[PDB]
Amino acid sequence: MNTVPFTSAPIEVTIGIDQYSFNVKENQPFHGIKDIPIGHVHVIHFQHADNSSMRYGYWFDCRMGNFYIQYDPKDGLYKMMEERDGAKFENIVHNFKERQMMVSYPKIDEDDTWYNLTEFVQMDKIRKIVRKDENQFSYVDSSMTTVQENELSDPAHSLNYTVINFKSREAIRPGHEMEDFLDKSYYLNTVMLQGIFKNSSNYFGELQFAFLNAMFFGNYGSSLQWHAMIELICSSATVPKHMLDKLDEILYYQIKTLPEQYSDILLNERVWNICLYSSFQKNSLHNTEKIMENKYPELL
Amino acid sequence: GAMNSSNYAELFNNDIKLFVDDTNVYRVTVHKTFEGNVATKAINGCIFTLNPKTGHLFLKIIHTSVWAGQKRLSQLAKWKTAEEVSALVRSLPKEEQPKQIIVTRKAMLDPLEVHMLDFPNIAIRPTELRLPFSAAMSIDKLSDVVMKATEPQMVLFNIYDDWLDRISSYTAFSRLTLLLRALKTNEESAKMILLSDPTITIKSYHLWPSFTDEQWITIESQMRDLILTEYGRKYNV
Numbered sequence: 001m002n003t004v005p006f007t008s009a010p011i012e013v014t015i016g017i018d019q020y021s022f023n024v025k026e027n028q029p030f031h032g033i034k035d036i037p038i039g040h041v042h043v044i045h046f047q048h049a050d051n052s053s054m055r056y057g058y059w060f061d062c063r064m065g066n067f068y069i070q071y072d073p074k075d076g077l078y079k080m081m082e083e084r085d086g087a088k089f090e091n092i093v094h095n096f097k098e099r100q101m102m103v104s105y106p107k108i109d110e111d112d113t114w115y116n117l118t119e120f121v122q123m124d125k126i127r128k129i130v131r132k133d134e135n136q137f138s139y140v141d142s143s144m145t146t147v148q149e150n151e152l153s154d155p156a157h158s159l160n161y162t163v164i165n166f167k168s169r170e171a172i173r174p175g176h177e178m179e180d181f182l183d184k185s186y187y188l189n190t191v192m193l194q195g196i197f198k199n200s201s202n203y204f205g206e207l208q209f210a211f212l213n214a215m216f217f218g219n220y221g222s223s224l225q226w227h228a229m230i231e232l233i234c235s236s237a238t239v240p241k242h243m244l245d246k247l248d249e250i251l252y253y254q255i256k257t258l259p260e261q262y263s264d265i266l267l268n269e270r271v272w273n274i275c276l277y278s279s280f281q282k283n284s285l286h287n288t289e290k291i292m293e294n295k296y297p298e299l300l
Numbered sequence: 301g302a303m304n305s306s307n308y309a310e311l312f313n314n315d316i317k318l319f320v321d322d323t324n325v326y327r328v329t330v331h332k333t334f335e336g337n338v339a340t341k342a343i344n345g346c347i348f349t350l351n352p353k354t355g356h357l358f359l360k361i362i363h364t365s366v367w368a369g370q371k372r373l374s375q376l377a378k379w380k381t382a383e384e385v386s387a388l389v390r391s392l393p394k395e396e397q398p399k400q401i402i403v404t405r406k407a408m409l410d411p412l413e414v415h416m417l418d419f420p421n422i423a424i425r426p427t428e429l430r431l432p433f434s435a436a437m438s439i440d441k442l443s444d445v446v447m448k449a450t451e452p453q454m455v456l457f458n459i460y461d462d463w464l465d466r467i468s469s470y471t472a473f474s475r476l477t478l479l480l481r482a483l484k485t486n487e488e489s490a491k492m493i494l495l496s497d498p499t500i501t502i503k504s505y506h507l508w509p510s511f512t513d514e515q516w517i518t519i520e521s522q523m524r525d526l527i528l529t530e531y532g533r534k535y536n537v
């Protein structure tokens with residue numbers, strides 16, 4: 001188990017860790033989060049009490065360094081930093097534990113939710129989507145735009161997701177216009193899986209990270225990318241059986257985890273109806289279809 | 301964006317544009333099979349691609365052989381339309397290629413957009429106007445050349461005959477659409493109006509009769525009356 005200590009909590013803030021959150025009061029004696037499972041990426045995120053706009057947070061992996069949070073009163077946010085001095089860190093952590101100034105990452109042992117949401121998410125891939133190579137962790141916020149959004153402005157602050165565009169020369173073979181537009185299997189299997197992503201695991205990882213950014217930060221660009229990656233699979237007649245089964249599990253846990261009151265802002269009616277009822281794969285997402293129907297029958 | 305009553309004069313400006321109508325591309329007679337089931341039999345069709353300013357009509361004839369062994373033909377017809385329009389554009393010199401293509405039916409937007417990816421600067425637009433180009437096969441010479449074709453074929457016409465020597469494009473388009481609207485609403489009466497006078501003939505190289513200016517005003521009046529008449533007969537007004 002690993003720990004992310006906090007120097008202090010000078011401003012009142014709701015702090016998220018993965019799918020958990022707790023409220024911290026102005027200058028409450030808070031010094032961080034302990035018992036964080038090793039082996040998964042994690043995200044630690046903040047929504048200030050006094051200005052819920054600009055949700056921000058940090059993607060990190062405890063195996064890649066010792067990280068802590070410290071409030072910056074000049075830039076006005078909780079910043080993640082890496083501590084290079086190892087004995088300084090353990091000492092800080094151990095003192096804060098002894099004083100029990102840390103919340104415990106509250107993982108129910110039956111519960112595989114986080115694993116199931118991050119199964120294919122690797123830090124190395126996150127850092128290629130979020131470019132900032134001097135830090136081992138990644139900042140993402142609610143307002144950050146995607147490379148594709150910037151096409152249709154500040155490039156350094158972009159989410160460099162893989163651009164998917166169904167009416168693009170990348171998607172459409174000359175001479176197979178109708179074929180490729182109505183059955184995206186070429187685009188999925190040759191262009192994206194074989195060409196760009198190299199395998200389904202990297203494709204799923206980006207999809208899962210886009211969903212998590214969309215739900216946790218309220219990032220519109222991330223919501224768009226998640227739906228595009230789902231639609232490219234549902235709109236392909238020819239998808240490996242193992243991808244189809246895994247997709248059903250992936251989406252299941254995403255829909256299961258989504259707040260019930262955010263359906264209006266985080267789910268695209270057209271995509272889900274197409275994907276569940278009209279697409280080639282209308283019959284291949286039994287678990288996702290089941291949960292979508294019992295939990296969001298209004299959207300449909 | 302979309303084209304409508306408000307931006308109606310844009311059609312006659314000096315930016316090259318084309319209307320594409322696909323309503324006569326896939327044409328069938330539905331009939332009964334010996335077993336009492338229903339089968340379709342296709343007949344030749346055509347893409348109606350029209351420059352509204354110049355009157356130049358690119359009449360691509362769609363021979364029934366293009367459908368042989370194909371499924372979901374109404375869907376295919378939109379993509380074959382789009383394939384053939386794209387090929388026309390590619391065949392034209394650069395300075396003749398359109399800057400905009402307006403489809404008369406919104407179901408052509410995606411097929412045409414996808415076929416024209418090589419031409420990002422050519423705007424593909426729908427229209428809110430209900431244009432009567434479906435009635436093009438009521439023009440005898442157009443119907444004739446389509447039905448006689450034995451192979452794929454492009455035929456070029458000026459749908460305005462020589463009208464632009466005497467009237468503007470705006471007026472020539474309004475006349476064309478009134479004629480077509482009347483042929484669409486009551487083909488028989490419309491054709492009776494255009495030919496009632498044996499002394500007014502159609503030039504070998506024209507589609508419509510050689511009316512003087514005064515005779516055209518009379519003709520146009522009679523076409524309006526017919527359209528209003530049929531509106532009462534239909535609606536009982």
Ligand SMILES: C=CCN(C(=O)NC1CC1)C1CC1
Nearest residue numbers: 214218219220223264265266
């Ligand atoms: C907090 C903002 C929510 N968003 C949003 O405007 N969604 C609109 C309904 C499509 C983004 C998806 C996260």
